[PDB]
Amino acid sequence: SHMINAKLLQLMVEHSNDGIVVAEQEGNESILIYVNPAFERLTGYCADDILYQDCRFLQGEDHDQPGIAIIREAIREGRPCCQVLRNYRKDGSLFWNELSITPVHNEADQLTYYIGIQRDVTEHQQTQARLQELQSELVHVSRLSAMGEMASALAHELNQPLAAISNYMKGSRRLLAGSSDPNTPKVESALDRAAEQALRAGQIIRRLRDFVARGESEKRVESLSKLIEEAGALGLAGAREQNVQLRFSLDPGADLVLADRVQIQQVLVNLFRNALEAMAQSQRRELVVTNTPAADDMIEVEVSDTGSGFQDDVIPNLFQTFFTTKDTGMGVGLSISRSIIEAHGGRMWAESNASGGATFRFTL
Amino acid sequence: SHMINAKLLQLMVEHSNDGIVVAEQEGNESILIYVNPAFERLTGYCADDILYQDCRFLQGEDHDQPGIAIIREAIREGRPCCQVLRNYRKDGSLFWNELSITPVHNEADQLTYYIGIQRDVTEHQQTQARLQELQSELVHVSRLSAMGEMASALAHELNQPLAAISNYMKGSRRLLAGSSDPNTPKVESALDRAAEQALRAGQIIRRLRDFVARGESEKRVESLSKLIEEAGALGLAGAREQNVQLRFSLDPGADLVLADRVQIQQVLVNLFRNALEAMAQSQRRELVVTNTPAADDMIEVEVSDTGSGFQDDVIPNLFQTFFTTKDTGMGVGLSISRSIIEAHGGRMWAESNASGGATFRFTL
Ligand SMILES: Cc1cc2nc3c(=O)[nH]c(=O)nc-3n(C[C@H](O)[C@H](O)[C@H](O)COP(=O)(O)O)c2cc1C
């Protein structure tokens, strides 16, 4: 049964864009007997140089890879195997090789051959590792930031009552100054100790607040394209699921800003999450990000959605700490974002959009 | 130039474990002219049924995939393309097809053919999506848990001073009870207001504490294998990098426990991070996880490393809130872990290991 002529197959294999090799078993060596030009391009070795010897030279000295042992076991067993490992071109460049090997037995000559299809997954590996770094740093930064915001909010809430207590103690001392009652000394002493405890309370606040503020707010030259893509990999994963239409109408002339990177990443991740959640129950789901020039040699970024939008009595409350409309929401994202923008030398505000959604703007 | 006979190539292609097809361009249709048995197995269609018609029937009614348009554009242009999309077997099963297509022009008959190598990436896609779900839920749970622990720690720190203030106010009122000084009423009133403010402070504590405790501590029947693997995907990624040797010496007879899943995931993620960090600067890096039967129809889990270990004056401080030895550490992991184990009906403790590392045990 021949569906196509073997010449045609050979032609397709030769011109395929994936590296395709065929090897022959000779004891512990699986010598190459065919390589297609895609393999030559991927590896940089010429076919005249590497025929009739095992492919393991692509590993170099990097033999500390479990995939190698997996492949050796698969060859010994006789089963196929797909594995991804680090290989090196003739010039020394490192690349990630996803190779599928199928051992097949030729009964014409009773030999064991293998067909190997190999492709470059280096870009996928790099993006995935970058995403892992981002997820780890984002978890650490989110824990620290939430704790710090909690501490600051408590301090602000408790400043009035402790101050009032101190002032009452001061006033009571002043009233008792001119007293002849025998109990007055003890009373005074009692009040004194009370005052001490009040001050101690304040101290405790700072003693933990500064404990969690152990992170310095750096600012460096940063590419907006880069930090938008870094934030997007975490926050904008899953656009296909909610059928959200993404549009980045970006200006190549307004790309470089002065910013930190972990803080802008966390601001954008939070904005992206809030926008995706607000458009989760929307009919038309479209998110637009745009940059424009602004005053004071700044650049303004606008993010507009078709989400749940802002009710009339909502917009001036958005940035107040603990304000949320969600059952499980905390209401910390925008407060942290506003503190980050103000620390970096910009302004942030919100408005309703003409589609019933929300438009956020900030400057840097 | 023929390195191998075309019959041999055909044989290798036929027996390859990856689906390999060859198609021919006829206007808007790329009709299949060859399919290898791997493709038949992957799709479930017989070659006699599907030859000489376009592959798009594998999509079914799921045409809302951008990869389809990408491939159509690539075919129009004439370039290769690798894309992953959802396809469906003849029985209706869904699978993830990674297909690489290379268009090649045959000048023998001046036609355009395509060679397509297609493999199943369904398992990889599922594991990656599960990891995305885990990272999202872990971020949310970590923010909430950190905030709650912060609030509880503040409350515990501030209980003494506020109580002391209240007691001083009470004592002062008792001393002033028997007084004739004209200023005594005002003094009393002042103290009264002071007392109010003290109580208000306490109220504020609860008003935020219960605000962040908006999460119910569920407990369900859970597989230890499953929750260890779920926690490992996040926390144990990167074993190859630090050359850490993982050993799960597990008991199939002691696999089912009564536990929550998000909370045990977060406990294990934290333990895995602490163990990886402690072995980061170690010479021999080996992590062992083991389960054994314990009293009261419980099961005890042991996790041992060769890490930095415990100094003599360290072990009884490990679980106290804010205790850490790291420059950027917060010291919240073990306190939360102990509260989780105690809520689920178990005990948790630590000891030094014979290799200079740390051994942690818990019961459920
Ligand atoms: C057809 C075929 C292609 C192979 N291609 C590669 C390759 O591209 N890169 C690589 O590092 N190993 C490749 N290998 C694996 C090595 O040839 C070798 O089998 C592997 O290192 C395990 O054997 P070893 O432990 O003796 O090295 C290939 C093997 C076969 C059969």
Ligand SMILES: Cc1cc2nc3c(=O)[nH]c(=O)nc-3n(C[C@H](O)[C@H](O)[C@H](O)COP(=O)(O)O)c2cc1C
């Ligand atoms: C060689 C080859 C193999 C293909 N294999 C598949 C496949 O396995 N599954 C699939 O959904 N589409 C596959 N396609 C793509 C479809 O044939 C079709 O070209 C694609 O849907 C874009 O064209 P359309 O928009 O007219 O459908 C393959 C295309 C070629 C050339």
Ligand SMILES: Nc1ncnc2c1ncn2[C@@H]1O[C@H](COP(=O)(O)OP(=O)(O)OP(=O)(O)O)[C@@H](O)[C@H]1O
């Ligand atoms: N694009 C938007 N459209 C409509 N409402 C919005 C939008 N963005 C924010 N909001 C509302 O304003 C609030 C601002 O608070 P924030 O976004 O920080 O809260 P959250 O994301 O619920 O909290 P957290 O991130 O701390 O769990 C949101 O909780 C939500 O109620």
Ligand SMILES: Nc1ncnc2c1ncn2[C@@H]1O[C@H](COP(=O)(O)OP(=O)(O)OP(=O)(O)O)[C@@H](O)[C@H]1O
């Ligand atoms: N396996 C271990 N070997 C040696 N020291 C350890 C080990 N596990 C924990 N420790 C020490 O005990 C402390 C227990 O606190 P915890 O692990 O919660 O802190 P952390 O991970 O630094 O803090 P956080 O997770 O809140 O940032 C650690 O900070 C560390 O100093």
